[PDB]
C-alpha cells in the first residue's frame, strides 16, 4: 500500500498519473512510440499539510534504494567561487545511468527541501555576492541540457511557492507543481485513523474515544496540527490514572496502562494547541465578553438575518461572495453580533479582522496585513471574515475629513474580489458611522445592510436588566417606575458601563446612581 | 528533589506533560502504543523571569549531560554564504545516534538562547544577500524528513514572541509556546524562600527579616528584578558592618558576626524602585510638585470619583477595561489629580504615558512608545496608565486644525482594547479641550469624564491660599476684602504662578501686586 497519508487521495493519485504512471507498466510501450518521462515534482502548501511526509514515503514506496536527500541550504556554505559544485556532484552518481535502463519504478530521486533557499531569482535579482544566481542556473541546466537522466525525479518542496524561478517551473524542469492544502472534514477522519492505529491498548485507543467526534469539531487545522492533538492527549494519558501520581520522583507502571480517554483529547484541544490558523477558537470570546443576551426582538431580528444570509453563502452558486454590513449607533453591540453570527455560522475558517492587532501600522502595513487575511480565506472551501470597525481600518477622523485612501481602495476592491471558483466567502462589517460610508460609496459595495439599534423602550431596558440580573426586584421596581413610558436610547455596551458604575456605591444607593447616569 | 525555580509550578509541570511525560516514564509502552517524542519547547517572556533559568536547570534535571548551548547570533559568523556550517554541525553529534543505537539514549538538548535574532522569515525576503532566510530553513529542515525517532530537543527562548517565524512554531517542530510572566503573590514567597535559603546566620538571616511580609509589598516586579533585591540588601549590610573609604578591609569582623536586618532590605527598596513593572513612588512625584491641597468640594468630588472608579476596575469582571477623562480648563491641576488618583489606588503597575518624554518624536514613534506602555500594562494582573495631556500626544494645533492622525488612531483603539483574560487596566486621561476631543469622536470612547474646575468663588480662593500658607493674616484680610464682591476664575497651577511672582516684590507691595495680576 503506503504508510499513512491522510486525506491526500486527490493528490497522491494525481502524482500517480504524472510520475508513477510511466516507468513500471509501459516500458514495452514507451519503447515503441513513447517520449520523455517526468522530470520533477514541486509541492506547495502552508506548513503542516504533509509535504515532507510524501518525500519520506515516495522515497520509499518507489523502491528506488537511493534516496539522495539534500537539505535546502546544505550546498551554499563553501568557499566563495566553488559553491555551485555540490549539486553537480549530486546528479553525477545518477548521471552514470545515461547509458543504461532498468525496471521496477526507476531508481534515482533528488529531494530538495524548502527549495526557495537555493532557487531564488524570481525575476528581481534577489541576493548579492554573485552566488544567489549561479546556484539557480547551475540547477536550471543539469536537468535540461544535454539530456539526462530520463530516470531522475527532482522532488522539491517549499512553503513560499511563487518565489521560485519561473524558468524552473516550466514542465521541462519541474513538471508538476501541486497544491497540498489542509485536509477537509473527510480527510481528518483519515489521518486520525492513521496516528491512532499503532495504538492498540484495549481496542485501538480505548473504548470511549470516537474519532468521528474528533473529526468534526477539530474542524480545520492541518496534518501535524492534528498529530499534535493525539500526541498531547496520550501524553496527558501519561499523567492520568497510571501516572497522575508520578510526583517527580517517578513511579513505574503500577496501575497498568490506562487507555487514552475522551477527556484527554478535549482537554488537549482546550489547552494548549491553538490551531495557528485560527479556527473554532481564535479567542473570539475577547469580543463576546458578557455573552449575548436577547434583550429584545431586534436581537433575534439581526441574527436570523445572519443565518438567512449565512445559508446564502453555503448553498449558492450565483453569488460566491456575500458581503453584509452591520451598522448602528456606537456602543450598540455590533462586534459581538458580528462574531456571534460568524461563530454560529459553523464555517471552518472564521477570522476576525479587527484593527486592534494592527495598531500603529501605516497605510501600507494595513493593506499588507489585510491581504494576508483574505488570502487565508481564499485557501478554504467555506470561510467567514469579520472586517470589524471599518472606520478604524480607514483611520478615519471627521476633522476636515482625513482617512486612508490607500486602505479604502484596497478594501473597496476586497468587498468585490471573487475567490477561486467553487469557494465561498462571507464578509461581515461593523461600523458606527453609516453616513460617512455613504460618501465613500462603501454602502454600494456591501450586498445588504443590517441595522443594529440601541435599546428602544423601557420594557427592553428592564428586559436587558432581567437577563443580566444585577438588581433586586424592589430595586428593579424603582427603575420600572421611571423608564416605563419614557424615551431611552442607549447602547447595550454602554448599559454595561452604567450598571457597573452603579454597583460601586452604597447598597441602598445603587438605584438612583443608575438613574442619575441614565439621564445622559 | 529539584534545584531552585521560584513560582513556576504551573509552567514547569506543563513541560512535564510535553518533553518529560514520554521518553522516560514507561519506557517500553511507547513503542507498543506508538508515538513520536516532542521536538522542543518555546519560552516566551518579559525580560528577567526565568527563561534562561529554565535552560540551565532543565539541562541538569534531564541527566542528559551534553547541552549543546548555542548563543543567539552565534551561528551567523562566517563570510556571506558560509553561515549554515554551524546549524548543521549543531545536530551532527545527535545525528550520529541514527546508528545501531537507533532508539535507547538519546542525548538530546540544544538551547537557542535568543532565537528571535535568527528566525524571522518575513515572507517578502526583504533583506540583502541572505541574512535571515537561509539560517531559518537550514534549521527548519534539519529537524524533519529524513529523521530518526529522534534524539534532539530544541529549547528556544525569546523576549519577543510573535516575531519568530510562524512556520517554525507548528506542532511538528516547536510544540509548546509557554508563557513565562511575572509571578503572583504566592510565587514570590517561593523565590524569596529560594535565594534566602543559603543566606544564613544559622539557616536564615535574622529574626526581624520575614520574607512573607516582603512577599506582599514587593508585589509586581519579576524574579530577576527580585534577586537584585536580595543581593543589594546584603550589599547594604556589608557597609553596615565593614568600613569602606580606601582599600580598607580591616575586619576581621567587628561584631565577630554578621546578619542582615529588615532595615537593610527596605534600605534597598529606595533603590530597585520596582523596575519596568510597578512603582513605589518611582519619581512620578515630578507631576505632583506642590502637593494636592483640598480647597473645596470640587477637589474631593474629583479624587473620590476617581477612587470609586478604581473600585470598578478592581472588583468587577463584567467590564475589565475602565477609562476616564479628567477634563477642564487649562492650568487647572488636571495632571496632578490624575497622578493622585493613581497613587491613592495601590495598583501594582502605574506607568504615566506622558508627552514630556516624547519631545521631537515623529508620528510613528509616538504610537510605538505609547504601544510599549500598554503592553507592559497587559503583562500585569492590575494596571493604571495615565495618558496625560491628550492634545500634546495628538500634537494638536487649531489653525486649520492639524494633528497626528496616526496617534489618534493608535489611541481610539487602545481605549477599547481589552487586556487578556482576567487582567485589568485603568486608563486615566487629562485634557484641556473637551470640545476638540468631541470633534474627533473620543468622548464617545471614554466611559466617563470629570470636569476639574477652576476656583470660582472668593471663598475657595481664600481657602486655597490658607492651605499653601504664603501671606499674612492681616495681608489676607486685605485679600479677603478685595476678592469678594466680584467673582474670580483662575486655575490652581496659575495661582501658584501669581503667588511666587507676588512675593518677589517689595513687602509693602506684595499684596497690592497680587490683587493686580488677579484682575485678569
Ligand atoms: N495527510 C497526512 N497524513 C498523515 N500524516 C500527516 C499528513 N499531513 C501531515 N502529517 C504529519 O505531519 C508531520 C510532518 O509533516 P511535514 O513535515 O510534511 O509538514 P510540512 O510543513 O508539509 O513539511 P516542512 O515542515 O518540511 O515544510 C508528520 O509527522 C505527519 O505525521
Ligand atoms: N444581544 C447582544 N448584542 C451585542 N452585544 C451584547 C448583547 N448582549 C450582551 N452583549 C455584550 O455587549 C458587548 C458589546 O460590545 P461591542 O464592542 O460589540 O459594542 P460595539 O457597539 O461594537 O462597540 P464599538 O462599536 O465601539 O466597538 C459585548 O461584550 C457583549 O458581551
Ligand atoms: N522563578 C525564578 N526563581 C529563581 N530565580 C529566578 C527566577 N526567575 C528569574 N530568576 C533569576 O533571574 C536570573 C536570570 O533570569 P532570566 O533567566 O529570566 O534571564 P533572561 O531574561 O532569560 O535573559 P536572556 O533572555 O537574555 O537569556 C537568575 O539569576 C535567576 O536566579
Ligand atoms: N487641589 C489641587 N489639585 C491639583 N493640583 C494642585 C492642587 N493643589 C496644588 N496643586 C498643584 O498644582 C500643580 C498643577 O500641576 P498640573 O500639571 O496638574 O497642572 P495642569 O492643570 O495639568 O497644567 P496643564 O493643564 O497645563 O497640563 C501641581 O504641581 C500641584 O502640585
Curated annotation (Swiss-Prot), chains A, B:
Gene Ontology cellular component list: cytosol; Golgi stack; midbody; plasma membrane
Transmembrane segments: none
Enzyme Commission number, as recorded: 3.6.4.6
UniProt keyword terms in alphabetical order: Acetylation, ATP-binding, Cytoplasm, Hydrolase, Magnesium, Metal-binding, Nucleotide-binding, Phosphoprotein, Protein transport, Repeat, Transport
Biological process terms in GO annotation: Golgi to plasma membrane protein transport; intra-Golgi vesicle-mediated transport; intracellular protein transport; positive regulation of protein catabolic process; positive regulation of receptor recycling; potassium ion transport; SNARE complex disassembly
GO molecular function ontology, one term from the record: ionotropic glutamate receptor binding
Post-translational modification: Phosphorylation at Ser-354 interferes with homohexamerization.
Keyword Endoplasmic reticulum: no
Manner of cofactor binding, per the entry note: Binds 1 Mg(2+) ion per subunit.
Entry binding sites for Mg(2+): 335
Positions of post-translational Phosphoserine modification: 354
Assembly information from the UniProt record: Homohexamer. Interacts with GABARAP and GABARAPL2. Interacts with GRIA2. Interacts with PLK2, leading to disrupt the interaction with GRIA2. Interacts with MUSK; may regulate MUSK endocytosis and activity. Interacts with CDK16.
Functional description taken from the UniProt entry: Required for vesicle-mediated transport. Catalyzes the fusion of transport vesicles within the Golgi cisternae. Is also required for transport from the endoplasmic reticulum to the Golgi stack. Seems to function as a fusion protein required for the delivery of cargo proteins to all compartments of the Golgi stack independent of vesicle origin. Interaction with AMPAR subunit GRIA2 leads to influence GRIA2 membrane cycling.
Protein name: Vesicle-fusing ATPase
Organism: Cricetulus griseus
Gene responsible for this protein: NSF
Amino acid at each position: 500500500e503506503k504508510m499513512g497519508i491522510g486525506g491526500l487521495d486527490k493528490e497522491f493519485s494525481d502524482i500517480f498519473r504524472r510520475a508513477f504512471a510511466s516507468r513500471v507498466f509501459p516500458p514495452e510501450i514507451v519503447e515503441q512510440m513513447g517520449c520523455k518521462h517526468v522530470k520533477g515534482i514541486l509541492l506547495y502548501g502552508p506548513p503542516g499539510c504533509g509535504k515532507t511526509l510524501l518525500a519520506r514515503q515516495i522515497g520509499k514506496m518507489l523502491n528506488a534504494r537511493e534516496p539522495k536527500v539534500v537539505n535546502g541550504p546544505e550546498i551554499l556554505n563553501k568557499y566563495v567561487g566553488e559553491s555551485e559544485a555540490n549539486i553537480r556532484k549530486l546528479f553525477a552518481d545518477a548521471e552514470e545511468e545515461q547509458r543504461r535502463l532498468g525496471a521496477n519504478s526507476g531508481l534515482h530521486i533528488i529531494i530538495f527541501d524548502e527549495i526557495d533557499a537555493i532557487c531564488k531569482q524570481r525575476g528581481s535579482m534577489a541576493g548579492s555576492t554573485g552566488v544567489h544566481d549561479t546556484v539557480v542556473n547551475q540547477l536550471l541546466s543539469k536537468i535540461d541540457g544535454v539530456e539526462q537522466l530520463n530516470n531522475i525525479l527532482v522532488i522539491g518542496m517549499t512553503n513560499r511557492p511563487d518565489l521560485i524561478d519561473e524558468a524552473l517551473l516550466r514542465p521541462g524542469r519541474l513538471e508538476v507543481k501541486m497544491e497540498i492544502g489542509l485536509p477537509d472534514e473527510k480527510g481528518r477522519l483519515q489521518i486520525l485513523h492513521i496516528h491512532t492505529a499503532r495504538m492498540r491498548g484495549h481496542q485501538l485507543l480505548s473504548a470511549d474515544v470516537d474519532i468521528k467526534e474528533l473529526a468534526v469539531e477539530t474542524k480545520n487545522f492541518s496534518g501535524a496540527e492534528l498529530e499534535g492533538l493525539v500526541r498531547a492527549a496520550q501524553s496527558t494519558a501519561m499523567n492520568r490514572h497510571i501516572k497522575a501520581s508520578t510526583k517527580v520522583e517517578v513511579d513505574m507502571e503500577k496501575a497498568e496502562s490506562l487507555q487514552v480517554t475522551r477527556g484527554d483529547f478535549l482537554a488537549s484541544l482546550e489547552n494548549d494547541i491553538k490551531p495557528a490558523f485560527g479556527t473554532n477558537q481564535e479567542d473570539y470570546a475577547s469580543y463576546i465578553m458578557n455573552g449575548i443576551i436577547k434583550w429584545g426582538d431586534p436581537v433575534t431580528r439581526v441574527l436570523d438575518d445572519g443565518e438567512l444570509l449565512v445559508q446564502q453563502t453555503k448553498n449558492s452558486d450565483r453569488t460566491p461572495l456575500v458581503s453584509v454590513l452591520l451598522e448602528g449607533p456606537p456602543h450598540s453591540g455590533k462586534t459581538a453580533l458580528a462574531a456571534k453570527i460568524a461563530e454560529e455560522s459553523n464555517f471552518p475558517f472564521i477570522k476576525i479582522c479587527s484593527p486592534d492587532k494592527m495598531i500603529g501600522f501605516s497605510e501600507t502595513a494595513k493593506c499588507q496585513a489585510m491581504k494576508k487575511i483574505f488570502d487565508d480565506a481564499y485557501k478554504s472551501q467555506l470561510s467567514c471574515v469579520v472586517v470589524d470597525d471599518i472606520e478604524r481600518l480607514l483611520d478615519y477622523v471627521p476633522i476636515g475629513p482625513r482617512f486612508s485612501n490607500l486602505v479604502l481602495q484596497a478594501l473597496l476592491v476586497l468587498l468585490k474580489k471573487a475567490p477561486p471558483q467553487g469557494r465561498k466567502l462571507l464578509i461581515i462589517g461593523t461600523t458606527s458611522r453609516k453616513d460617512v460610508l455613504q460618501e465613500m460609496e462603501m454602502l454600494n459595495a456591501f450586498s445588504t445592510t443590517i441595522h443594529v439599534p440601541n435599546i428602544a423602550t423601557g420594557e427592553q431596558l428592564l428586559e436587558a436588566l432581567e437577563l443580566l440580573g444585577n438588581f433586586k426586584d424592589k430595586e428593579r421596581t424603582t427603575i420600572a417606575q421611571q423608564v416605563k413610558g419614557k424615551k431611552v436610547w442607549i447602547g447595550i455596551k454602554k448599559l454595561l458601563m452604567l450598571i457597573e458604575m452603579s454597583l460601586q456605591m452604597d447598597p441602598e444607593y445603587r438605584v438612583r446612581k443608575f438613574l442619575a447616569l441614565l439621564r445622559e
